[PDB]
């Protein structure tokens, strides 16, 4: 089937550079236009740039014109977005897409997206504290940067009743979230509840036992 797979995002300093890649499978990018579309946190979709790989003709949004360069290598079936002079306003999930049927099918296939965070703040792994206890219990995942973190319970064996809240940005500039779960009161003190926290940007993995 058709696939578009992005790579290259991450945390970068303001004023810096970063190159994203979009690897196409199941079709030849010589046949279509390839696009980059981005989405700032909590905002809508914004087209960034397009390229026609056969002749390399490009178009850009005014917001990135001159700073960004879209390119493609048909022999690698891959397109690229070279980002320069990066600003905080460029923080977004970057998607690549194609025009299907020379545009008739619009953007029919999209990549999974790659998160680009433009910030001067350093990476920091979270501290994990128990939210001790139908009963409710959880874990407080505090003071980390950048996004994202993932949380599971009992290595995935506990899923029903779990609510992992979206992170909030604290006044300190660090993120924080809680993950909670409701369980039968009769299970406390014997059944073990462990939250599994992963923060890939800082290479931090924490398993925290939550005891009453």
């Amino acid at each position: 089937e058709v696939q578009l797979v992005e790579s290259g995002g991450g945390l970068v300093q303001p004023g810096g550079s970063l190159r994203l890649s979009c690897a196409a499978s199941g079709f030849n990018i010589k046949d279509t236009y390839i696009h980059w579309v981005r989405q700032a946190p909590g905002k809508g979709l914004e087209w960034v740039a397009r390229i026609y790989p056969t002749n390399g003709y490009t178009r850009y949004a005014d917001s990135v014109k001159g700073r960004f360069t879209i390119s493609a290598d048909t022999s690698k079936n891959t397109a690229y977005l070279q980002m320069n002079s990066l600003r905080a306003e460029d923080t977004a999930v970057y998607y690549c897409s194609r025009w299907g049927g020379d545009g008739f099918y619009a953007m029919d296939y999209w990549g999974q997206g790659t998160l680009v965070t433009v910030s001067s703040a350093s990476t920091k792994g979270p501290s994990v504290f128990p939210l001790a206890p139908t009963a409710a219990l959880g874990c407080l995942v505090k003071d980390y940067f950048p996004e994202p973190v993932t949380v599971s319970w009992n290595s995935g064996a506990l899923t029903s009743g779990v609510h992992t809240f979206p992170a909030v940005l604290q006044s300190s500039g660090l993120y924080s979230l809680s993950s909670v779960v409701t369980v039968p009161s009769s299970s406390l003190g014997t059944q073990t509840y462990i939250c599994n926290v992963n923060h890939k940007p800082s290479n931090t993995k924490v398993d925290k036992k939550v005891e009453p």
């Binding site: 809508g44 397009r50 998607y95 099918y105 504290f129 407080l140 809240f165």
Partner: protein, 213 residues
């Protein structure tokens, strides 16, 4: 240079309802309009192309139509899995432009929250900060009022809220409110209370604890 004015910005409908989302192009765009669905944490998904054509694999309850510069996405029988943000798009000219989006939530009966309060852990206190967490579990509608009282004094500026996306199975929301204090300030007070006001509650519910007890 062509704008897409999408309405409404958000809507709530019950399962089985017929949903209408509209998009008005600022000038003629022929039929070069597409509709997309985007669920939380996922890439957009094509629903309709060339104004009125159902895209491969998309359920038949989705349909699109055009009248002049006005474009309409219809969901004939709203399903719980249709909770998402919907976007129109024109590609008659460059740049292709998107509508601002329509947030679609599933309407359901009122459900009161289950409320829980959590004191700061002894491990966090040793670090020097104290976080107090109030949980509102599985409620509807989304709107709720959560106030913190410390020694019966109303708090301001020291709490942050987070709300989950609508649950796929029961269409409820859950909410956390987190009060942040220094360890020194936390140890200067006794009663920590979160008071919850919600349509599903006859009167506000208060959950509290006394520090140390």
């Amino acid at each position: 240079d062509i704008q897409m004015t999408q309405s409404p910005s958000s809507l709530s409908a019950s399962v089985g309802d017929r949903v209408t989302i509209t998009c008005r192009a600022s000038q003629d765009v022929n039929t070069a309009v597409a509709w997309y669905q985007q669920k939380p944490g996922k890439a957009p998904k094509l629903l309709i192309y060339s104004a009125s054509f159902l895209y491969s694999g998309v359920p038949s309850r989705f349909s699109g139509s055009r009248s002049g510069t006005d474009f309409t996405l219809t969901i004939s029988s709203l399903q719980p899995e249709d909770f998402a943000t919907y976007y129109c798009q024109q590609h008659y000219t460059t740049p292709p432009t998107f509508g601002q989006g329509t947030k679609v939530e599933i309407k359901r009966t009122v459900a009161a929250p289950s409320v829980f309060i959590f004191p700061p852990s002894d491990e966090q206190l040793k670090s020097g900060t104290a976080s107090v967490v109030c949980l509102l579990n599985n409620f509807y509608p989304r709107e709720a009022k959560v106030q913190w009282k410390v020694d019966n004094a109303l708090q301001s500026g020291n709490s942050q809220e987070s709300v989950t996306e609508q649950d796929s199975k029961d269409s409820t929301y859950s909410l956390s409110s987190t009060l942040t204090l220094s360890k020194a300030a936390y140890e200067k007070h006794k009663v920590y209370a979160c008071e919850v006001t919600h349509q599903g509650l006859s009167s506000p519910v208060t959950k509290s604890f006394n520090r140390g007890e």
